[PDB]
Design a protein around this ligand. Sequence first.
Ligand code: HEM
Ligand SMILES: CC(=O)NCCSc1nonc1/C(=N/O)N[C@H]1Cc2ccc(F)cc21
Length: 375
Amino acid sequence: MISKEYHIDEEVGFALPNPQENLPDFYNDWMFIAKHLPDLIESGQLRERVEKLNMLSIDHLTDHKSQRLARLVLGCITMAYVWGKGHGDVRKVLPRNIAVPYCQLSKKLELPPILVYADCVLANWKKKDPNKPLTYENMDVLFSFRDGDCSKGFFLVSLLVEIAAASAIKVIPTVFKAMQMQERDTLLKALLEIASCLEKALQVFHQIHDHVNPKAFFSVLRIYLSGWKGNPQLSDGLVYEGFWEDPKEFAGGSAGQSSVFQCFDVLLGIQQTAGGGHAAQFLQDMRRYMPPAHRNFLCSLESNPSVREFVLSKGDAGLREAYDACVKALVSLRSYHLQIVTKYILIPASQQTGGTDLMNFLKTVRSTTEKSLLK
Ligand code: HEM
Ligand SMILES: CC(=O)NCCSc1nonc1/C(=N/O)N[C@H]1Cc2ccc(F)cc21
């Protein structure tokens, strides 16, 4: 079993299990704004209401779940304040009374002061009925931006792919213990289970089409998840007033900030973060947007002996085929992901070189996965 320090749940994996919905009464002013972003943004009163906040201390966020909720709350409020109605008028300064506590909490959790995948997917959910299982119909998100923004479909399908992958993650200690104890049969079984689970994760991905509309994502939801690293709208980044004097750059939310695909890249010896290209650079930089416990886990998998080199050294077709099934499952996820990028970015953008450059980046990562096949 995985060590408690890494914050990996048996059921939900890298997701925060049963995350908090309500903060203490102390932070009701934060909560009212974040719960009513659709109306507040539409009516153009969000920014005024953010500006008229008092600075609330982060000391009354006592445990990890409450601190994670606060990040999600302040994260969503921050994106609403920056992007406004999502029509091009941007705020270049985040006000003192929200920026300071958001930055203090962010330093405490070792995350950047911007909404990340870990906020808006991994901590942004609940069960409708606690006695029923983790399915779309029994689940809801905690926070959305605009009416018709498809954020429930968008965040929960990502979460459900994330949860599907958790079943493979709990096998990882079996993989390594089987290698050191020279348990061939155990290792093969473990690889066939990981492949099975990553194949299941692809079928969960199919649900995106049912619950997320292309126009709604591209025209609205993508605007609010946008960051301010290399963004012409905020050339120099965002001024976090009273915490830093100069404006800081931070990347927007992405499932590239997921620890799932990186975890199995590392496990399988798919050297994605090697080579020194844009792919490698991006994927390593994205680890800074993961929770510290999760990047520590990825660091620990890299420190372990190579599964790839173990399977190559044995002259064992069954193990090679079980290993290739895991790699091929990752290739399939990435192949399917490209089709989603086509539907959800490329076509809406055309209806409105970067598009070619984007697809070639993703194809490079997939090509590096494909190259790790043994036969
Ligand atoms: C509306 C649907 C989606 C769109 C339009 C989309 C788009 C993109 C884009 C443009 C990138 C390149 C990185 C960047 O520009 O920051 C990317 C990377 C990535 N995406 Fe998505 N994505 C979607 C859904 C998902 C989902 C649900 C997952 C799985 C949870 C996922 C997994 C990944 C991963 C792991 C990367 C990093 C590159 C890699 O490892 O292949 N994406 N995505
Ligand atoms: C918002 C923006 O422009 N980000 C930089 C470009 S990457 C991107 N865009 O939009 N979606 C992206 C995605 N990249 O893996 N997966 C989707 C799935 C998901 C969950 C949370 C999130 F916050 C994003 C996503």
